[PDB]
Amino acid sequence: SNAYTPALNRPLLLNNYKESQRRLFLFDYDGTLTPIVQDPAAAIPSDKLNRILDVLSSDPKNQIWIISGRDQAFLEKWMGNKNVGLSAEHGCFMKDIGSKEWVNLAASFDMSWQEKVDDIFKYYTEKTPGSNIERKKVALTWHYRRADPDLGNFQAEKCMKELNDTVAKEYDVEVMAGKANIEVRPKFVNKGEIVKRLVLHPHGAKQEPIEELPDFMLCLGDDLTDEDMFNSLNEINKKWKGDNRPTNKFGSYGVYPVAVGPASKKTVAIAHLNEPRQVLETLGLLAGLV
Numbered sequence: 001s002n003a004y005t006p007a008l009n010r011p012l013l014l015n016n017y018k019e020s021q022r023r024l025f026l027f028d029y030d031g032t033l034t035p036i037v038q039d040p041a042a043a044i045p046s047d048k049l050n051r052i053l054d055v056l057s058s059d060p061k062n063q064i065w066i067i068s069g070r071d072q073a074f075l076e077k078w079m080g081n082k083n084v085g086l087s088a089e090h091g092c093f094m095k096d097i098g099s100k101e102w103v104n105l106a107a108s109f110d111m112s113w114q115e116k117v118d119d120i121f122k123y124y125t126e127k128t129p130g131s132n133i134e135r136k137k138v139a140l141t142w143h144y145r146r147a148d149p150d151l152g153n154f155q156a157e158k159c160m161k162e163l164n165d166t167v168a169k170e171y172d173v174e175v176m177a178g179k180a181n182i183e184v185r186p187k188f189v190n191k192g193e194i195v196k197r198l199v200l201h202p203h204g205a206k207q208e209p210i211e212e213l214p215d216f217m218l219c220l221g222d223d224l225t226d227e228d229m230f231n232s233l234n235e236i237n238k239k240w241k242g243d244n245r246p247t248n249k250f251g252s253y254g255v256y257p258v259a260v261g262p263a264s265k266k267t268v269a270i271a272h273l274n275e276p277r278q279v280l281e282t283l284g285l286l287a288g289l290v
């Protein structure tokens, strides 16, 4: 490949799952629980995913969170009546399983960068047929999947450069290259913050000691934004081993950051699964389905 991570050890994952009492699932949505497609509106939950989520969420030992770049509207639509936590726009919003409203973690942040990013995106959109701009509440996304590969990638690279030389110097925003996109959002909100707020927290209490901490954490993602999740989990794991916390029967703390992508994909995750298909197989396995 040459392989960068080993394939996920599914039997071990299953064993740690069935041994554990306080489980926390941290799921990316796009390209992770459902395949990457041309039309974002078509990225709809499969029945298999729905069955997995129902069975998994029904176990009171389990807490499940969907942590996505998607805006709140999408997540409410396709995940809202399911018994799962929601986080939108790469860490800008959170909604507890019991809660009736979202928390805007970026509510106090300066948003004046948005129009400058928008202006820049409009320029590259005009020079890139098939591309379009997605304006969410906080984050902005420039899509070029539908464009010609070469021009899109070319235009993308110099859009990336320009944002990073202007807006990213003037504001504390992160310029993220995603699968056939560019996304811009405040630097100090991200999926890693979300994971910290969920993991270092009494299982599974709403948002504002070892027996109350998760003892099983499974985190899946496919894109650059999700590296923030994997990194937060690695840091927490290392914090726990820096301290001399008692390990489980497997010599670990039950932390499984797992990339979705080929063996060769560079990631700080501990293992990979090739595609959403294998993700659902694995979750199905844990669920007692197939």
Ligand SMILES: OC[C@H]1O[C@H](O[C@H]2O[C@H](CO)[C@@H](O)[C@H](O)[C@H]2O)[C@H](O)[C@@H](O)[C@@H]1O
Binding pocket: 029, 030, 031, 035, 036, 037, 038, 039, 040, 043, 068, 069, 070, 071, 134, 141, 143, 145, 178, 179, 180, 181, 183
């Ligand atoms: O498969 C549909 C699209 O998925 C990605 O983009 C969507 O998912 C991102 C992460 O949740 C969001 O940030 C983004 O706003 C969504 O459109 C992918 O990047 C696209 O190329 C796909 O068309």
Ligand code: BEF
Binding pocket: 028, 029, 030, 031, 032, 067, 068, 069, 070, 223, 225
């Ligand atoms: F919903 Be994960 F951002 F694709």
Ligand SMILES: [Mg+2]
Binding pocket: 028, 029, 030, 031, 032, 221, 222, 223
């Ligand atoms: Mg994704």
